């Protein structure tokens, strides 16, 4: 209880932690706090004391902090509210990195959420470097989107997606992703094309699987089991063979499951004989 100093304050330093909450309000010029933001995280203020520092920053920058101040927020980012962050114009990848790094392992809060929304809206795209930075901190990020959003990310951005990121994608997401990978990759030749496109084939059509078979590509069993079903179904026993290359023997091992049972059943039992392998099922005489 009061409203003046006795001594004021002109440096933001270890002395401040001994102030009472109002003394801080009385003695710290907000414009000074802003100007020495790069050293607040070194001073072990108490969290209630941080509240009064945050408030001061609001006074000074009432329509949103400048990136001059955001950069050095450090752990103060934990005290922002999404309305706070919605006023910002963060445009350096590095600043973003800095802010993500503070809640690194946590379930994306509304704060980092709005932060990320602000950042992308304000580049117009997910470009690529942006997507790199994001899957570095939130791996399931691309598949955390929703086919509406995914239709907007430009094929340029696809080079930043690593296959293990597609693990949590469901087929309606791959439906919009695969045509994007197709564009991102036409400059590739053959064995190089396949190694890139592989993860995206869960949304490919038969027209495109067929064309792959006619290449040398030596598709692994794991990726074949992720193929469509509707796309594998019209594949001739000859085509599936040339596709799986030296991995054909998997078929008997996945005789029961996924798109293979379905693919067996639609085949002339006198064709499955050509495979060695000894596949049971499918249509006789």
């Amino acid at each position: 209880t009061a409203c003046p100093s006795g001594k004021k304050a002109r440096e933001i330093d270890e002395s401040l932690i001994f102030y009472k909450k109002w003394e801080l309000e009385a003695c710290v010029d907000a414009a000074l706090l802003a100007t020495q933001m790069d050293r607040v995280n070194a001073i072990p203020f108490t969290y209630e004391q941080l509240d009064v520092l945050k408030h001061k920053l609001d006074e000074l920058y009432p329509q949103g902090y400048p990136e001059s101040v955001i950069q050095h927020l450090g752990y103060l980012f934990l005290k922002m509210s999404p309305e706070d962050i919605r006023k910002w114009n963060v445009t350096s990848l590095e600043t973003l990195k800095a802010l993500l790094e503070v809640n690194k392992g946590h379930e994306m809060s509304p704060q980092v959420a709005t932060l990320i929304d602000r950042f992308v809206k304000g580049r117009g795209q997910l470009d690529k470097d942006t997507l790199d930075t994001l899957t570095a901190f939130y791996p399931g990020y691309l598949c955390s989107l929703s086919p509406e959003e995914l239709s907007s990310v430009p094929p340029s951005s696809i080079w930043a997606v690593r296959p293990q990121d597609l693990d949590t994608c469901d087929p309606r997401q791959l439906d919009v992703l695969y045509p994007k990978a197709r564009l991102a990759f036409q400059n590739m030749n053959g064995s190089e094309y396949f190694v890139k496109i592989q993860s995206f084939l869960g949304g490919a059509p038969t027209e495109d699987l067929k064309a792959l078979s006619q290449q040398n590509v030596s598709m692994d069993l794991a990726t074949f089991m992720k193929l469509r079903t509707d796309a594998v179904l019209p594949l001739t026993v000859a085509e599936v063979q040339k596709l799986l290359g030296p991995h054909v023997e998997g078929l008997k091992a996945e005789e029961r499951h996924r798109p293979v049972r379905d693919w067996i059943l639609r085949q002339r039992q006198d064709d499955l004989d050509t495979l060695g392998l000894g596949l049971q099922g499918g249509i006789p005489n």
Epitope: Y47, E48, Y75, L78, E107
Partner: nanobody, 115 residues
Framework: DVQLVESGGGVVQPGRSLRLSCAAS????????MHWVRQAPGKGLEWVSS????????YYADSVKGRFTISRDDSTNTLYLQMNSLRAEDTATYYC????????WGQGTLVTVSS
């Protein structure tokens, strides 16, 4: 003033139960996640449990999974840690903290001045 005060342990047959509690004061309890941190006398301190500010997210160390369960009563500024299936290594000093970093440290190094 802040201040948050624990209570509870003393006397424990290996396999019984025990409930600890933390009385919180001086800060908006709701808006800080809460953590139980463990100091086994003679070794360093290890984080054991944490609960988000909105009681939505619990976390437990493997040494304790299945045996401990945290709760948080937002109505009355108190934190709880329920300890079923108490083993022997559980014997230690139990701290309740709101610290934003908990376990942001190595095993420390021991500095001893004077022989």
């Amino acid at each position: 003033d802040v201040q948050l005060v624990e209570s509870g342990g003393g006397v424990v047959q290996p396999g019984r139960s025990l409930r600890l509690s933390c009385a919180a004061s001086g800060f908006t309890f709701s808006s800080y996640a809460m953590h139980w941190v463990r100091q086994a006398p003679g070794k360093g301190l290890e984080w054991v449990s944490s609960i988000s500010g909105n009681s939505l997210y619990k976390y437990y160390a493997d040494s304790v999974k299945g045996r401990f369960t945290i709760s948080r009563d937002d109505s009355t500024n108190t934190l709880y840690l329920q300890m079923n299936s108490l083993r022997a290594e559980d014997t230690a000093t139990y701290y309740c903290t709101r610290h934003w970093a908990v376990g942001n440290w190595g095993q420390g190094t021991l500095v001893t001045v004077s022989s």
